[PDB]
Amino acid sequence: LPPERPLTNLQQQIQQLVSRQPNLTAGLYFFNLDSGASLNVGGDQVFPAASTIKFPILVAFFKAVDEGRVTLQERLTMRPDLIAPEAGTLQYQKPNSQYAALEVAELMITISDNTATNMIIDRLGGAAELNQQFQEWGLENTVINNPEPDMKGTNTTSPRDLATLMLKIGQGEILSPRSRDRLLDIMRRTVTNTLLPAGLGKGATIAHKTGDIGIVVGDAGMVDMPNGQRYVAAMMVKRPYNDPRGSELIRQVSRMVYQAFEKL
């Protein structure tokens, strides 16, 4: 990869947009794989992860598959202690009913299924075991403190953690080629695309995972531009409950960066 080269001008403009919003606290990190152009505006700060942490969890899932510790077809049980409200469809099924591991992992991501997420976290050895794995990958502030949906926001991450994990995955680290491609497919098929994707130009594609606990909103992933360029992106915003300004801010920053890389 090319060296990191701050886009000083654009960084400055984003910090201005951010800082002139009273009751929002934003953090973001973008990195262009071709040019090395980078953007870091509160990117290292710790945020409640909300559902963005499901991305690291998915990586851990496919790591276990690669290592033969989990199989794609093994049956996982929706135990009463794992059932969780908020996003998801498994919660409406019979307690102790069973699902193929890959189906559960996919639902965790595509619809942010919180029951599926608890099922996967439990199958992979629990929170502590995953927290250890996240540290191994260089995620410094990505920690699972409680089950999902974790509406209180106890589980943490950072924009830099999320984007750098995606950088590694994009570049073929951590996961096998088969698992990598499965992961990217799943992360192209999520149902919440009102944040980073809404700032992208026609023909761009994005593998990503959103998170929203009302009090925090964020998104992270990898964008492929029609011009051939690739970049990773992550942004988190602390907001008043369901404040549309927080989600619009992500859209605005997504658009600014997309258009900057278009012109460059």
From TrEMBL:
Residues 27-237 form the Beta-lactamase class A catalytic domain. GO terms for biological process: beta-lactam antibiotic catabolic process; response to antibiotic. GO terms for molecular function: beta-lactamase activity. It comes from the Bacteria. This is Tll2115 protein. The chain holds residues 102 to 365 of 368 of the full protein.
